[PDB]
Structure 1
């Protein structure tokens, strides 16, 4: 079926939970043996969210190459994304090592450091220009260059230096700061505006390594971001945009990381975002 009318048909019939459970039943199951090794317990935020072995990002290290991160490669859309958990106190250096090694231009953050009165990820970037951060375990230096605070999101320019080689690179930090502590946003308008700002920066384009996207677990809000982006790109590329099937795209993405889209409300919000977005594109 088309999307907008399939949407109203699920609303009128109140069957979002059944649709979402079908997706959960059909989703791929691949091994994640490296994630479950005992030496990696303090590298995982949640015991039930792990990268598959076949698609995990490897750190360029011989001691321990493990990080909780996955490469999502969308062949028809010609887009790639790295989805990862919010960094932990003992993985902030690994996180920036990955950004460096994978040649990423942008980092997309969809959570606040504290939500619901608990810490959802480490404070992994510097908050003042004159107070830079050094990660001694991976030999990197990170400096805040500029910060632009807007009503729904903040954009930061960061400098990442590989202290071994003295090479430097400019990284863009796109921080969506207004996702509610509970539920999903009422309108997708600010989330779509944010997606378009990431696109306009070059961070999603083939001349760079894959964008790094995270929330707390790296599957819920993070899944919504890449699902909406890929669906909109396919609607622009194809002769028949009504042939884009958001459930089929989500199942393709779940071949590369488990659990993408965590609730039926997140599924409904993803439909809403693609529907409204397709009108603005034209």
Structure 2
């Protein structure tokens, strides 16, 4: 017998109402202060003028004269899973990015974009593609590529993150989804879910390590799609009955504009329906 979400999907797909449902979510989303993002000193720390962390959820860089990074802590209590969503780092904010990864005790970075997409640069090359050490002098960190695992539609890089100021080093799993087009969707729910399950298997979404860092270019479209599916499946695994629109609206209180297109919203539902079948 069809589930509630399955029946919802069927009616939206047969009446072609994804586009109206998406606009309803934009209309029902709540705006919050995001004033720090607008300080003149933070102008060069934002990739997109219209995409800003909220002041009540932004990740703060500790012990820094300027604590600002365009990154949001998304903390759904019912899920007992918190994530950081951030933009693709700029050349001048790669140093802040790794500082945040260190301070947050992050174990996994999930990167959903390619560096160059639709004839523009979406993200700085913030990790070594070769054996040379990548140095971030502004915050005192160095990154080395230890190993790579190239799969058919994604690559996992094992990165060694060195805090030069404390001597300590940590291994970071860098999960690079290389087949997710900008403003588009993954090739299939199955391939998306296989990737999500591999991120989960690394234990890097558990409450024992720090929050995983998810990013694309703006940190809201593909990153929001990936987060909505992961959060809804986590809530479904706990046995609580969810409404996808309400979960997305709740997640939008932590970071504005999660899910950029009706097709992305549609894909979320599809992946959640397929994920529920595994559960």
TM-score interval (norm. to shorter): over 0.9
- How far apart, in 2, do the equivalents of 1:128 and 1:15 lie? 47
Which position in structure 2 is the counterpart of 1:39? Answer: 41
Question: Given the alignment of the two structures, is residue 75 of structure 1 paired with residue 73 of structure 2, yes or no?
Answer: no
Q: Which runs of 5+ in 2 are unaligned?
A: none
Note the C-alpha offset of 1:203: 0.7
Residue from 52, 55, 60 that aligns with 1:53? 55
Which position in structure 2 is the counterpart of 1:199? Answer: 200
- How far apart, in 1, do the equivalents of 2:109 and 2:245 lie? 26
2:183·2:222 contact (CA, 8 Å) conserved in 1? no
Q: Which runs of 5+ in 1 are unaligned?
A: none
Which position in structure 1 is the counterpart of 2:87? Answer: 85
Note the C-alpha offset of 1:254: 0.6
Note the C-alpha offset of 1:116: 1.0
- How far apart, in 1, do the equivalents of 2:67 and 2:175 lie? 27
Q: Deviations over 1:62-106 (max 9, x none)?
A: 411100000000101110000000000110000000000000000
- How far apart, in 2, do the equivalents of 1:206 and 1:186 lie? 30
- How far apart, in 2, do the equivalents of 1:249 and 1:28 lie? 13
Residue from 269, 272, 277 that aligns with 1:271? 269
Note the C-alpha offset of 1:166: 0.4
Alignment of 1:91-130 (within 5 A): 91-129=93-131
Note the C-alpha offset of 1:182: 5.4
2:113·2:182 contact (CA, 8 Å) conserved in 1? no
- How far apart, in 2, do the equivalents of 1:100 and 1:171 lie? 10
- How far apart, in 2, do the equivalents of 1:142 and 1:267 lie? 35
Give TM-score, length-normalised by structure 2. Answer: 0.97
Alignment of 1:134-149 (within 5 A): 134-149=135-150
- How far apart, in 1, do the equivalents of 2:64 and 2:117 lie? 36
- How far apart, in 1, do the equivalents of 2:166 and 2:238 lie? 41
Which position in structure 2 is the counterpart of 1:236? Answer: 237
Give the 3-state SS of the residue equivalent to 2:82 in structure 1: strand
- How far apart, in 2, do the equivalents of 1:256 and 1:171 lie? 25
Note the C-alpha offset of 1:181: 4.4
Give the 3-state SS of the residue equivalent to 1:178 in structure 2: coil
| Count of residues in correspondence between the two structures | 277
- How far apart, in 2, do the equivalents of 1:36 and 1:182 lie? 25
